Amino acid sequence: GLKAAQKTLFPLRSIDDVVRLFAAELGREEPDLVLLSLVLGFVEHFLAVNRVGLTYFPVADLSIIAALYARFTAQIRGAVDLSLYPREGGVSSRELVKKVSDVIWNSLSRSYFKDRAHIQSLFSFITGTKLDSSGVAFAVVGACQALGLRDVHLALSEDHAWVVFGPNGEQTAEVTWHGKGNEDRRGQTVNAGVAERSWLYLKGSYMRCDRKMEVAFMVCAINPSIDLHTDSLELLQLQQKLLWLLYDLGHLERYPMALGNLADLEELEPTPGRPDPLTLYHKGIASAKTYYRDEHIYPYMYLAGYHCRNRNVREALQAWADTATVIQDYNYCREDEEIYKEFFEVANDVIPNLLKEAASLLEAGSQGSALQDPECFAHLLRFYDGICKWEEGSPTPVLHVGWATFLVQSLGRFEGQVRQKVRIVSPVLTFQSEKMKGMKELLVATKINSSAIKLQLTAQSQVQM
Numbered sequence: 001g002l003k004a005a006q007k008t009l010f011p012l013r014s015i016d017d018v019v020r021l022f023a024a025e026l027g028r029e030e031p032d033l034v035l036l037s038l039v040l041g042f043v044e045h046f047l048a049v050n051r052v053g054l055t056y057f058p059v060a061d062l063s064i065i066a067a068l069y070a071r072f073t074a075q076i077r078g079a080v081d082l083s084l085y086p087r088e089g090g091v092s093s094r095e096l097v098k099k100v101s102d103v104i105w106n107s108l109s110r111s112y113f114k115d116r117a118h119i120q121s122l123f124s125f126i127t128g129t130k131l132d133s134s135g136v137a138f139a140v141v142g143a144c145q146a147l148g149l150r151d152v153h154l155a156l157s158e159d160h161a162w163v164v165f166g167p168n169g170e171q172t173a174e175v176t177w178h179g180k181g182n183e184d185r186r187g188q189t190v191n192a193g194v195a196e197r198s199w200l201y202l203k204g205s206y207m208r209c210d211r212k213m214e215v216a217f218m219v220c221a222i223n224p225s226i227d228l229h230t231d232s233l234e235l236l237q238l239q240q241k242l243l244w245l246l247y248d249l250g251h252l253e254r255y256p257m258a259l260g261n262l263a264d265l266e267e268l269e270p271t272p273g274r275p276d277p278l279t280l281y282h283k284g285i286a287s288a289k290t291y292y293r294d295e296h297i298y299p300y301m302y303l304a305g306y307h308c309r310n311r312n313v314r315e316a317l318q319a320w321a322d323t324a325t326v327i328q329d330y331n332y333c334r335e336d337e338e339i340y341k342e343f344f345e346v347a348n349d350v351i352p353n354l355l356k357e358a359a360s361l362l363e364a365g366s367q368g369s370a371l372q373d374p375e376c377f378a379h380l381l382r383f384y385d386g387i388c389k390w391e392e393g394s395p396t397p398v399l400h401v402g403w404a405t406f407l408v409q410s411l412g413r414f415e416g417q418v419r420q421k422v423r424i425v426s427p428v429l430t431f432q433s434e435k436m437k438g439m440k441e442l443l444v445a446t447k448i449n450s451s452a453i454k455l456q457l458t459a460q461s462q463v464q465m
Ligand SMILES: FCc1nnc(N2CCN(c3ncnc4sc(CC(F)(F)F)cc34)CC2)s1
Pocket: 134, 156, 157, 158, 159, 160, 161, 217, 220, 221, 257, 258, 261, 298, 301, 302, 305
């Protein structure tokens, strides 16, 4: 069960009391993932899922939390017999990790909506027998820690989760599902996905969590949403405070998305005497560059979205061009659909809306407009260049004529006299993709040749008779 020293802060009567509990666990050799997730899922359930009776904060009584902890630990200890899986050198075996994964999986409800909110925590596992995809992975890691398997840790990409374990922490194992329909490699390594250079496995530049970073994950996993138009202020505040705690302790150093999430919160409600959201976005980017070979897409997408929301068009374009410059060195593979959808929405909805507004504000006398800045046109072109390069040597195609219509529209937003100022070298820009190299003369012409652009972008061979 819980240690006497873990129980002394109960009952938890406020956000700050939950923060104190996290501070205490984080000061321990090994923070207790099961305890912490149970507390978070409890407080989340009574602040976002069922607010009936709420007066300030759902009090977390020790008797309630200890009973939940006991249900978890007994379920796992009862189902996983460790004597059957001998441990050399303080390291777990692939069979043991698979067993734990099987226990978690076989405990879940046969049928449910697998991307509902609030199914991420151990509280949900225990009270609802429901977990989302990365919730299963986290639950495997928490179950492993509860079994004393110190080597089993959470591994995270930008769209998937699995575990690492074994000698030197060098082994990988699939423990959960990914996406929709995708058919199990449960129990297998991730080395095939790494070898194929898909975004989903980050060319091996994925996060290998220590226990502190596992705490950070569960804090990022808090979901303040009450419905589509309403967030829990209490849960926002709790997540923000918990992320600052982690930050001050050093545990967001290797966690770009967490710094992004904290920047996003700070934009919504800034904490006096903290770094601005911009600074936090840039620390996320710096983290990706330092620890992950600058192979992450979301650090730039978080920046871009901030600049977008604030109508810093130039800086939004730049950051989306940087997103593309990351993606260009990946192969577009089957299970990377989420990042395709994001690039599709930026190219075909967000950019067009932004430039449409720019064009009206131009007509209204704007000065320093993105549409009169050749550097902005260059960013636009680099964005497409990365997408085209990504497409090169991918099994499936990325671009198609639906992209071409928006590209022509977006180019058309910039006058000839602006477009002709970008210097495309073999503002200065170098193209990496063959599509954009062959488009160069079309791009800087007075009248945009729409049909020729479409053929170049889509590699459509012929025009109709
Ligand atoms: F583009 C700007 C973004 N805004 N929100 C973004 N995300 C929301 C928060 N996200 C995350 N934030 C912290 N950690 C993780 S780990 C992970 C992969 C998973 F779910 F485990 F399989 C996702 C994710 C995912 C990306 S990106």
